[PDB]
Amino acid sequence: KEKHYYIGIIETTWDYASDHGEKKLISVDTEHSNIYLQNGPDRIGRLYKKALYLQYTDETFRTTIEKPVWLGFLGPIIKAETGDKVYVHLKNLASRPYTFHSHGITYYKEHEGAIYPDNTTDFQRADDKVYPGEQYTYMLLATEEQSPGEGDGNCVTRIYHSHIDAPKDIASGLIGPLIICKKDSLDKEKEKHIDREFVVMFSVVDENFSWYLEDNIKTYCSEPEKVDKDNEDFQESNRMYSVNGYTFGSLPGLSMCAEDRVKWYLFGMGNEVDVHAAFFHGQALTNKNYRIDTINLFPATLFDAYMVAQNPGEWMLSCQNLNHLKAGLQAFFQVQECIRGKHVRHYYIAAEEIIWNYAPSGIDIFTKENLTAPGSDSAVFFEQGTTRIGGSYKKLVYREYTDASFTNRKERGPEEEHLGILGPVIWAEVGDTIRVTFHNKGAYPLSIEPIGVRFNKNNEGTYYSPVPPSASHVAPTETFTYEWTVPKEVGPTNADPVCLAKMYYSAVDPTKDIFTGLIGPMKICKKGSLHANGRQKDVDKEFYLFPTVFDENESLLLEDNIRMFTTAPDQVDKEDEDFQESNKMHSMNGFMYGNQPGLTMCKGDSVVWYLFSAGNEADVHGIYFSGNTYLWRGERRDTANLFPQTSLTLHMWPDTEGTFNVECLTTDHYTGGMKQKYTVNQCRRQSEDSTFYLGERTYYIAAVEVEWDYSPQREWEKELHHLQEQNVSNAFLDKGEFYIGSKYKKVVYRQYTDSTFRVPVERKAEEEHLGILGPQLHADVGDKVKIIFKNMATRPYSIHAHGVQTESSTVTPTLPGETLTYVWKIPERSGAGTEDSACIPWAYYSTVDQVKDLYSGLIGPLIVCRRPRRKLEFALLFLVFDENESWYLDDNIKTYSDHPEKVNKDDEEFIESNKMHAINGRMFGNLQGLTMHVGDEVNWYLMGMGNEIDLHTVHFHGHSFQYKHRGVYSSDVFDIFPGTYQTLEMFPRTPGIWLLHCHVTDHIHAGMETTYTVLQN
């Protein structure tokens, strides 16, 4: 078929509403709405002028078609089954130039509707920028290459948006859904067997970016005269946390019937504070491929879910990111009312208060140093005195008891010793009923909210609307018996593991209860997978890990805690930056700096890890199990990623004896103490070894100190701006007064020919694209790689790598001038998992100082392949190099700064002047070397690392990619965070120079982009 759509871009006023009335008890935490929606002297209220796509009937952009109420300000839903020829007739009826760039479909440079130095000429640039009054019809092709994966649903979710300056064009309001179905999935422009199809975009629509900021200030502020746009609160007062554009329970239209087959197309959109956690309170929207309960979304994350509306009632959709939840990102939706499970599991739990100590040994187990040594990582969090609480905090948490007689606890075995602060594991099987007899015992009402089980409205553990103890409100001394059900439609899918890591927390006020201590593990399993004791049947060890930043400043018991441990409360300024840092407890299961115990097992044991987390947008973790590799959802990986409310079930079979680290790779977190140890003991006696390593490879690598330049040519930057017509100044690149430019000394891994290390291997063409990265080491499964590593720098470094097996756990640092040998064995578990592609990459890095060594430059890819036009390989490392952590910072200042004496290393402006947001070490088109031909088979090895900020949604303009074993899944955006190493298959089809970039606002403007060339066959 060949669809035609008429899209006009009009200017208009949008009201984030307030439905000027109530019946809306959003009351998860909520009331300071009047910042966001308050009109006034400075503030603008809930009315902003914003351009937006509308659908017209004819080429006469006069007669409009009306888009669903629930769609909010998004553009009209554009659909197309594979093989279609969609033509989009755009007419810019607005005050400035806009375009229409689509995400998941094929077109030529004359139809990209995106502007950048792509060496194209006039006929191909008509699309790339539509002026007011001009009309342009975009021709798109639903190719089989962009077709939803062999294992994707029938219709995936894609997006279209303007692209002169996308962040701004999108903040301005120009963005809509593009749903792509496979061959004849659709029927009457709706999926063949669905009842309701919805589109939801989570986003902190930041009005400070919209082109109409001025027009909005000058209009609504009563005193436009005196508003500081550069004012933190003014800015915050323009950030509209909202789902479909609507901000405080305002989303209308969401309505289905019970037994309704709903399909939801989600997608985030935003800057780096856009760490979302979509959650549909009422049911089991659990059909991604497996059963999912909460859906994480980031800038341009394209996601599709399938639900079967059940459990009739007025439910709620929210974003479990705490900060977003209290900034009002909720939206009612409802399933109108248009057998059970007899095995009763009975638990008795009391919430009790205690004085939790985050680190008992009072020492950093990792370094055997005193946890309060003057000026150290730990110091800040544990220093105790006048205005610093210190190490232990009167917390409040769940503990199990023997019976309604809340008299005697249950003895916690060495088995559950690791549990730390977490509550008592609640568990059950598919087809059961749970009855937790909660008994509050603290100075505040609380309750227990369970993620993952089926519960009626009488058992809802929170209260949203539109002295007895209620499920939602169990007062300080009352008690209540929640009843939950674990019916089929809420427990593990066929493709799911035997047990799903789950959780439960106090939901009287999530944004505060959890941080105080009310969070506990839960485990829902396939029917008959557990023994009487609650342990899986052929599993040796079951562990539960909860890494988070226990925000003590948000504890219900904060005041008391100030009163108890400070040597001067009255004097405690509760809002000092430094005060709140000292109480941001970066910890795992309650412990810090190595102090967590109980993670011991036998080599050969079948271990099963249950990970989960909660918290705000700073909860972007990369849990790294050093020394071993697990098996998640058919994929071999050794670093799990967790965000607000994420839950995972890892399966591991440790294979090397020793004491290894379970740590959170993401910098802040690691420095702040988010690292633990787990021990593998030898529990058998096994073999004599001259029987297996069919291959041997040896590489000679060295670490050199080079002068690196993040942007050696500034042309592409320059050209990109003039096209956009921007008056912008580059903070990171412009030497300015005393700033250090774009060049900084760094230490990097360069390959050599032999043990003499006097002749380096010349980087050929197919490897110019590696930039700062070390060489692409290759190893097949069954190898015994040997790295002869020589340190030519001026301070101890070493080389180690994820996924690889080693003899011991310790890693000897190579001293300068010294040359050592490291040996990595590449057994089966270091290679492709069952559903993995044949080659998978692992980052090799330096261990002397996990952090400073990295930012200093030391990083590279190890590709480990499985089996025995051309085939290409590219390695991309998206990382915001924090040049402030370089071991070489002092030299750079003296070497590069025009006036070193005038530099203050603490000056916020300076700090930022060093945050090089780059790809493989270079920003703004400066990443040369990515060239293929039409027809080639390309393998992109993407890997991210770094701090909390490192959310990187990689987008390739004009081409999509496939990704699991056999390219079973399709998409054009890939989510990447610290510790993510992924391999994407792609077949270039349309020739031309295309833009490759991170889709998150700060990152784009910062330079995280370059271009890849597809040459004509």
Ligand SMILES: *[C@@H]1O[C@H](CO)[C@@H](O)[C@H](O)[C@H]1NC(C)=O
């Ligand atoms: C575009 O034009 C010139 C020469 O072709 C130069 O800027 C560069 O080589 C070209 N850029 C790209 C991305 O091909």
Ligand SMILES: *[C@@H]1O[C@H](CO)[C@@H](O)[C@H](O)[C@H]1NC(C)=O
């Ligand atoms: C561009 O930057 C200059 C300073 O370099 C500034 O004075 C001016 O307002 C900006 N915009 C235009 C159109 O000149």
Ligand SMILES: [Cu+2]
């Ligand atoms: Cu985009």
Ligand SMILES: [Cu+2]
């Ligand atoms: Cu959110």
Ligand SMILES: [Cu+2]
């Ligand atoms: Cu972390």
Ligand SMILES: [Cu+2]
């Ligand atoms: Cu932090």
Ligand SMILES: [Cu+2]
């Ligand atoms: Cu990014």
Ligand SMILES: [Cu+2]
């Ligand atoms: Cu795009």
Ligand SMILES: [Cu+2]
């Ligand atoms: Cu783009």
Ligand SMILES: [Cu+2]
């Ligand atoms: Cu930044």
Ligand SMILES: [O]
């Ligand atoms: O795209």
Ligand SMILES: [O]
């Ligand atoms: O994009």
